[PDB]
Amino acid sequence: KVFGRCELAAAMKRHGLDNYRGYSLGNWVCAAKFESNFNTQATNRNTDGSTDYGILQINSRWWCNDGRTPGSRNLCNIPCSALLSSDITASVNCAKKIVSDGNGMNAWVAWRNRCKGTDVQAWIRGCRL
Ligand SMILES: [Cl-]
Ligand SMILES: [Cl-]
Ligand SMILES: [Cl-]
Ligand SMILES: [Cl-]
Ligand SMILES: [Cl-]
Ligand SMILES: [Cl-]
Ligand SMILES: [Cl-]
Ligand SMILES: [Cl-]
Ligand code: NA
Ligand code: NA
Ligand code: NA
Ligand code: NA
């Protein structure tokens, strides 16, 4: 599913991401924009053989099981395929664990490089939330 900008903002708010760990909704929408262009089915292979999945490009090294990432963990206790669902529940629940891990949203290098420090509220501007 490719979400619209305000549609994803609303879904993320519904699932409790707005101000989760102190990160405003626009942070999350911005990160989703640059990780996946709002596409739940986005996948990206990493040089290390891990793969990133879904709207927030969650990695198989630590967070989900895909059966093809040697030596990896599955800390969200999910098949990586759940991260590709039109239902963002599994992505959101897993993102909550990731952002709680110590480094906040810096875990998403695209967030650090493209969203951090910017006018992230622009990402929810105009939306009925
Ligand atoms: Cl957009
Ligand atoms: Cl915001
Ligand atoms: Cl497996
Ligand atoms: Cl594996
Ligand atoms: Cl594990
Ligand atoms: Cl599994
Ligand atoms: Cl949803
Ligand atoms: Cl933080
Ligand atoms: Na994701
Ligand atoms: Na894994
Ligand atoms: Na999901
Ligand atoms: Na950018």
* DSSP secondary structure of 42-89: -EEE-TTS-EEETTTTEETTTT-B-S-STT---TT-SBGGGGGSSSTH
Residue 41 belongs to a domain with what CATH number? 1.10.530.10
φ, ψ of residue 39 to 5 degrees: the values are: -100, 115
| Residue 54 Cα to ligand 4 middle (Å) | 17
- CA 49/CA 32 separation, integer angstroms: 22
What residue type is assigned to position 34 of the chain? F
Q: Is 66 annotated as a binding residue?
A: no
Method: X-ray
Is the Cβ–Cβ distance between 22 and 119 less than 8 Å? no
Q: Is 35 a catalytic residue?
A: yes
Which residues lie below 8 Å from residue 14, measured CB to CB, with a gap of 6+? none
Contacts of 63 (CB under 8 A, 6+ apart): 73, 74, 75, 76, 94, 97, 98
Q: How far is the CA of 89 from the centre of ligand 11 (A)?
A: 5
| Rounded CA separation 10/84 (Å) | 18
* Angle ∠(82,35,22) on CA atoms, nearest 5: 90
- Give Rg (Cα) of the chain: 14
CA of 15 to the centre of ligand 5 (A): 24
Q: Give the strands of the sheet with 51-53, arranged side by side.
A: 43-45, 51-53, 58-59
Q: What range does the domain containing 90 cover?
A: 1-129
Q: Which of 7, 48, 52, 87 is catalytic?
A: 52
Q: How many domains does the chain have?
A: 1
Catalytic residue among 35, 48, 87, 119: 35
Say how far apart CA 36 and CA 77 lie, in whole Å: 22
CB within 8 A of 27, min separation 6: which ones?
105, 111, 115, 120
Residue 31, Cβ density class (10 Å: 0-12 exposed, 13-18 middle, ≥19 buried) = buried
7 is catalytic: no
- Whole-angstrom CA distances from 64 to 25, 51, 56, 112 are 24, 10, 13, 22
105: left (phi over 0), alpha (psi -120 to 50) or beta: alpha
Q: What is the DSSP letter of 124?
A: G
Supply 12's token pair: 């993320």
Q: Can you give the resolution of this entry in Å?
A: 1.6
